[PDB]
């Protein structure tokens, strides 16, 4: 009941204010009672959005960062034509290290809108892609299964790729959003966008987010919040918070 009031007010004053005119998302602050005991990493666990799709994979600049020989993945995701129009750049990590050092890195940061890495390379990545990527929840590189094959123990896992599956995953990523755990109690998810959708979209988004986070099932991703949920403040980046639901 108050949420829409606070939302419209902040919307108005963020087109008004000069410094507030330059940023384009909304952050949500869920302050739990007890801290989540999960130690933080940068494996950004993903939450779904039932009603509305946030961004468009046919709008976002994408970097893809794969395993070593890169022959198979590059030729296939270029020649499948159901992904040929999909990725802006394909790079294996040997090339990434051999090509980008210094502040060409920061050139890549400002140039590329979303970075997605192979699931077995993500852990190695934070060196080469550098430190200024690992700021907040803006350009944390996500991680995707690529071959859709499980390595049974003591078995040479086959190396393969299916473009249908990879574009399915990326459509999932680009359609909904993602949180990241904390050793503390307050976290802020990324939701909304300024010009792209409106108040009922964002309100239903908020409801679905808090519902998924408070879902007592889906134990690695749903059953996560422990304790009583206290509050939720809506704000963009350079703003001041707006309080919602203080009970």
């Amino acid at each position: 009941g108050l949420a829409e009031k606070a939302l419209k007010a902040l919307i108005l004053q963020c087109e008004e204010n000069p410094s507030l005119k330059n940023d384009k998302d909304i952050h949500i602050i869920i302050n739990t009672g007890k801290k989540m005991g999960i130690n933080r990493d940068n494996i950004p666990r993903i939450i779904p959005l039932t009603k509305y799709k946030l961004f468009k994979p046919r709008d976002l600049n994408i970097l893809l960062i794969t395993k070593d020989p890169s022959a198979l993945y590059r030729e296939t995701l270029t020649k499948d034509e159901h992904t040929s129009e999909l990725f802006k750049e394909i790079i294996s990590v040997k090339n990434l290290r051999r090509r980008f050092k210094g502040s060409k890195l920061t050139q890549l940061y400002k140039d590329f809108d979303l970075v997605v890495a192979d699931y077995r390379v993500h852990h190695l990545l934070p060196e080469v892609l550098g430190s200024r990527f690992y700021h907040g929840s803006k350009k944390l590189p996500y991680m995707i299964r690529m071959s859709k094959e499980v390595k049974l123990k003591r078995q040479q896992m086959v190396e393969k790729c299916d473009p249908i599956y990879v574009r399915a995953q990326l459509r999932s990523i680009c359609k909904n959003t993602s949180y990241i755990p904390n050793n503390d109690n307050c976290l802020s998810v990324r939701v909304g966008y300024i010009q792209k959708h409106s108040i009922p979209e964002i309100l239903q988004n908020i409801q679905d987010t808090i519902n998924f986070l408070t879902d007592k099932s889906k134990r690695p991703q749903g059953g996560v919040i422990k304790g009583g949920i206290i509050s939720i403040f809506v704000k963009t980046s350079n703003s001041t918070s707006l309080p919602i639901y203080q009970f």
Binding site: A9, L10, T240, L242
Partner: peptide, 17 residues
Amino acid sequence: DYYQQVQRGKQDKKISR
């Protein structure tokens, strides 16, 4: 007319502390 209200809330809370 809500933004400056909650700003005053934050300000006055901390100076009261």
